[PDB]
Amino acid sequence: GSQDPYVKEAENLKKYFNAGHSDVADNGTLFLGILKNWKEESDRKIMQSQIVSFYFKLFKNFKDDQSIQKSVETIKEDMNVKFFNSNKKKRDDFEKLTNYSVTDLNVQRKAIHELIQVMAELSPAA
Amino acid sequence: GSQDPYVKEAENLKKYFNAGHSDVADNGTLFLGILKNWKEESDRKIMQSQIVSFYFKLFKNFKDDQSIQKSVETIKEDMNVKFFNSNKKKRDDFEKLTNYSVTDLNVQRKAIHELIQVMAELSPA
Amino acid sequence: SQLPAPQHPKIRLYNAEQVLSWEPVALSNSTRPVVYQVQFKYTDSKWFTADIMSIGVNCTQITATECDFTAASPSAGFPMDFNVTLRLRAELGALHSAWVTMPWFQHYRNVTVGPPENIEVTPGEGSLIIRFSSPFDIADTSTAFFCYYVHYWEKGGIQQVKGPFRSNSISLDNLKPSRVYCLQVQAQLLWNKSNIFRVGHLSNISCYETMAD
Amino acid sequence: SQLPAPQHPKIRLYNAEQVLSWEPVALSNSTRPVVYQVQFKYTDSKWFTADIMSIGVNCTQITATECDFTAASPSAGFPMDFNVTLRLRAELGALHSAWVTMPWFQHYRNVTVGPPENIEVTPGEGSLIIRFSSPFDIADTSTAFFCYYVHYWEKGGIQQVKGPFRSNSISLDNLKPSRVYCLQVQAQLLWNKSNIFRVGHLSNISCYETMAD
Amino acid sequence: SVPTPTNVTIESYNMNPIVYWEYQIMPQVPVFTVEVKNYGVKNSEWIDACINISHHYCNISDHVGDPSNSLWVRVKARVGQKESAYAKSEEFAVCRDGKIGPPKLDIRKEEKQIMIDIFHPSVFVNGPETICYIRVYNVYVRKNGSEIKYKILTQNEDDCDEIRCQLAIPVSSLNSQYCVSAEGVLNVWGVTTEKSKEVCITI
Amino acid sequence: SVPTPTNVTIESYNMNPIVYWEYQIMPQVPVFTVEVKNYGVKNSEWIDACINISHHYCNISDHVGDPSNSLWVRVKARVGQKESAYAKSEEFAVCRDGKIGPPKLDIRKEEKQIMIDIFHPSVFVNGYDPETICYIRVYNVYVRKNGSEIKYKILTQNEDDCDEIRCQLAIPVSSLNSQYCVSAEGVLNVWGVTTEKSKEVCITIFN
């Protein structure tokens, strides 16, 4: 009946990737096991960010499979709603950080430069 | 004198990478500009997580440069203290998520499987 | 080649309805009826054809000058949280017109909320009990809910507003017994993300007399 | 080849000191002195040689049976937040012994805190003023700090403990005037990350007489 | 070669799933073994549930980890000393594919209102912090000819506890017939529990 | 070819940095141009600070963005219509390389204690980018009673001890003759740069 739009589309991708086969149960879990260890939202957002960034990269690889484009882009928007709270700036800043190439010589020089002020505010505000 | 251990080691890497030259100022900022947009810790940790994963990735490529190994892993420990609160489990869970290959056929099938229950708890309680 | 674009499109966001309408496109030399194609896109996404698989209704190469996304079934249509952008064009075979692109909308943010339905009032001793239906059924109450206001006043008196209250039933306590009171019910959609509120339309006036004892 | 490993190593974590010691290794047929090598490692790190470049003290190829990390200069040694693991071995040229690996330590977590230094007590009207120095100087007070406890009692009386208090000066108000009181000062190191505490050692007992009025 | 079983299905009520299958009639009486494989356990392999059993069912309530975690069931047949190939079932999520009992409703009068108590279904009996629980209660209250739907969220500490949920509806002295039925909605898949037995009361 | 300047240095006090350089004496009077380039500005380009100036200094307080952001300074010389190559300086962080004034100390007696007021240096109080990393995190307050000194630490984050105008410390005292002399210094947040030590203020217990 009434269920969040991702459920319908997520199980559609489940069939396309054969994620319903009994062989997926092998070799533990990627995200579900870790996420149960961290109940504090600060810890969760640290882990969820890496998980959300993972799905966006995965969907980017299958942007050419037009069979699943409907299911993919619906889940992407629901992630934009649940995780980024529909904040377009939050979504756009997130995408910039991901796309930085760690082999771009200019990027690492700027990264090494900004390191001090990044470490300066890694700890929570007083 | 009394300063967090990263400062001494971070500016040593600046000299090694020539991050002190005036040409680094070009092309805006990577992290500093974004980090000033988000003051709420939930928003900060979302951004900082991607930044911390970036530095760990960068350090991993230079694991063979013995000139900077002391400075590199000293900064790593200070990150283990400041960002992960010295929680080894937090550090290890973070390291696991990063090492996941997005092209491993087995990994994406499991990711598509766990997607439903991941989305279920993306929002705060 | 090129055709004239459809004229003056409108997005009707009333209650749970989602209807896109436009003025038909005609030609002087018209050989066959012109069809239209509707497409939707999210904030940073690809354009999709509005077809039975994508949205559950057939809105491409259709003869009608409107398309109702919410007609098929409950919860069908675009999710009320999503940021949806629509565009439209008229085409006659190989010929097609320019894309008429609508402004972006989020359902909770742009909806025109109607009055509460099926209002029933029963008198009590110096009070009036009001039971009513919600303006429309929301899937997730945690993300959005309704706040109701009752505008009550004695006949020939000054306005008084009781509210807001979450429940669909309220008691108008402390009223003058055996006196006529008139009331109006008005809802308010609250979306926690928006931190701005949508003021719903008021219902018709209806006056009732309280009991004696 | 192979040598006997150093015997009974110990890590002294007292106040701000960080000293690794061990029992010497001897041979029957010994022509020249045996040296030792100390190495340190972080939680998920590489082993580093303890040399003037790495840690500011030379603890590689050394004849001594100890290695003092905090002796060189102020702020020298391992950061008191860090998870530090040390290992040790004896070597005689090509021959060396097995690695004796110490348990991991965090200084705030494993330190044995000493008593407050330079305690000065001055009597007041029905009171005693206590000023003292901190057990050691902490770089970041927000990360770790001291809570002080004063164990005071009248001669022939029962113990009473005032505390805890953050300041290095305290007033023992509400005391019997012109009476002798004996006191001890004891500190407590609190690390907010651990939310577990290091109980400091008490100072010597010293008795003082309060003022007249 | 012994034939493989057919039509393997899983039916769960109150998170107690049972495996069913069909087998052809044969001169001998065949015995079966039922094996379960859960998602979310380290080094997951097929766990034996029922061993060399002669009937066509197997209760696997003990093999239910998280009611929101997928699980698979396969069954093979043994006749004499020769066994058959496995008959694997579709993935089964107790929260999604299963069904939950109705909540218990209690009604009582007060001076100016009616207190409706919505007791959680018998599943949530203390006697594990899973995704599968109730997020909203659809409480249908029919007064005379018309019924209006109410929504009570479990997250509201002021309206629900772990043992009960309450809803207060004002009433008047005139003749009125209040009939109340309530159902629960699950968090992830929106699966509706069975509708409670409609309890009424009159003024 | 006109020679390039030499020995470029930057000295900052109270976040007012001045650029200095040396140049050889010549028959004509040469003029210089000083250009600043900050880190953290989109499409960063060199900003002119002093234009065709004849002396050997240039106050660039207006070109200070974040006191913790690096900035670079280069200067060239012009004689007649011919110019010289630029003389670039090392990177300069106002918070790291600069120096900050001392705090102002006020002392006053009460019945049972002494209230020490530590007013922040005049840089941070005014009616020069705000919300910066660069500020004081702890105050090292040294209290000498007769011969003996004990170090105190007051954290800026403590709302109960510090506000936007001052920081306070309360020390209990007794009736006997005592000489309390107090000096205080500030420590910067990231680089730990210590401000100048305050002028020692004393007080005596005559009663």
Ligand SMILES: *[C@@H]1O[C@H](CO)[C@@H](O[C@@H]2O[C@H](CO)[C@@H](O[C@@H]3O[C@H](CO[C@H]4O[C@H](CO)[C@@H](O)[C@H](O)[C@@H]4O)[C@@H](O)[C@H](O[C@H]4O[C@H](CO)[C@@H](O)[C@H](O)[C@@H]4O)[C@@H]3O)[C@H](O)[C@H]2NC(C)=O)[C@H](O)[C@H]1NC(C)=O
């Ligand atoms: C400060 O830093 C130290 C050093 O890194 C940490 O101590 C280590 O902590 C890790 C856990 O993060 C330990 O790793 C464990 O090792 C086990 C095997 O090692 C044992 O046996 C060898 C001898 O061959 C010795 O090293 C030692 O006696 C060990 O006891 C593994 O079996 C463990 O894995 C198991 O558990 C995990 C988690 O449940 C599962 O995922 C695995 O599949 C497996 O079941 C584990 O990897 C390591 O042994 C510790 N070293 C020492 C010397 O103690 C401190 O924890 C750290 N302190 C803080 C506060 O951060």
Ligand SMILES: *[C@@H]1O[C@H](CO)[C@@H](O[C@@H]2O[C@H](CO)[C@@H](O)[C@H](O)[C@H]2NC(C)=O)[C@H](O)[C@H]1NC(C)=O
């Ligand atoms: C919803 O998505 C739309 C589509 O991107 C956003 O509208 C446009 O956004 C771009 C990029 O931010 C702007 O350049 C346009 O000016 C926007 N259009 C209009 C008409 O303003 C819209 O901002 C999104 N909504 C939210 C709340 O983020």
Ligand SMILES: *[C@@H]1O[C@H](CO)[C@@H](O)[C@H](O)[C@H]1NC(C)=O
């Ligand atoms: C599980 O991992 C092993 C290697 O670690 C691999 O051989 C195996 O195929 C994996 N399981 C599945 C179902 O792919």
Ligand SMILES: *[C@@H]1O[C@H](CO)[C@@H](O)[C@H](O)[C@H]1NC(C)=O
């Ligand atoms: C800045 O980026 C441009 C391309 O976007 C590049 O050509 C240039 O070299 C970059 N700046 C520096 C100092 O490398």
Ligand SMILES: *[C@@H]1O[C@H](CO)[C@@H](O)[C@H](O)[C@H]1NC(C)=O
């Ligand atoms: C959509 O409706 C129109 C009616 O004008 C029809 O011609 C067209 O074939 C329909 N499309 C599909 C895919 O059924």
Ligand SMILES: *[C@@H]1O[C@H](CO)[C@@H](O)[C@H](O)[C@H]1NC(C)=O
């Ligand atoms: C919805 O409202 C927002 C803000 O008022 C506006 O920017 C947007 O254009 C509106 N959308 C439509 C379709 O009117």
Ligand SMILES: *[C@@H]1O[C@H](CO)[C@@H](O)[C@H](O)[C@H]1NC(C)=O
């Ligand atoms: C309210 O008044 C309108 C007239 O504008 C009418 O159409 C509508 O039916 C009335 N509502 C009810 C419940 O009678």
Ligand SMILES: *[C@@H]1O[C@H](CO)[C@@H](O)[C@H](O)[C@H]1NC(C)=O
């Ligand atoms: C370290 O000290 C020992 C003293 O036994 C000395 O032999 C050795 O040369 C020293 N190492 C260095 C690098 O100076």
Ligand SMILES: *[C@@H]1O[C@H](CO)[C@@H](O)[C@H](O)[C@H]1NC(C)=O
């Ligand atoms: C330090 O303390 C921890 C527990 O707090 C203990 O596991 C460890 O062995 C200790 N290390 C030393 C060197 O005493």
Ligand SMILES: *[C@@H]1O[C@H](CO)[C@@H](O)[C@H](O)[C@H]1NC(C)=O
């Ligand atoms: C405390 O007593 C010990 C004797 O055990 C002595 O060595 C030490 O100096 C005394 N401390 C002071 C401050 O007098």
Ligand SMILES: *[C@@H]1O[C@H](CO)[C@@H](O)[C@H](O)[C@H]1NC(C)=O
């Ligand atoms: C198995 O199920 C199918 C479809 O439901 C049905 O046609 C068939 O008769 C069933 N087989 C048995 C043995 O009941």
Ligand SMILES: *[C@@H]1O[C@H](CO)[C@@H](O)[C@H](O)[C@H]1NC(C)=O
């Ligand atoms: C299955 O077995 C469990 C105990 O193992 C029992 O509680 C449950 O009621 C059984 N299922 C049914 C349907 O009886």
Ligand SMILES: *[C@@H]1O[C@H](CO)[C@@H](O)[C@H](O)[C@H]1NC(C)=O
């Ligand atoms: C310039 O600096 C160098 C090195 O610091 C010094 O030797 C030289 O004397 C300086 N020249 C002048 C003119 O100050």
Ligand SMILES: *[C@@H]1O[C@H](CO)[C@@H](O)[C@H](O)[C@H]1NC(C)=O
């Ligand atoms: C530098 O200039 C600023 C603003 O122009 C001024 O406030 C400051 O006093 C000047 N400093 C010096 C040393 O001249």
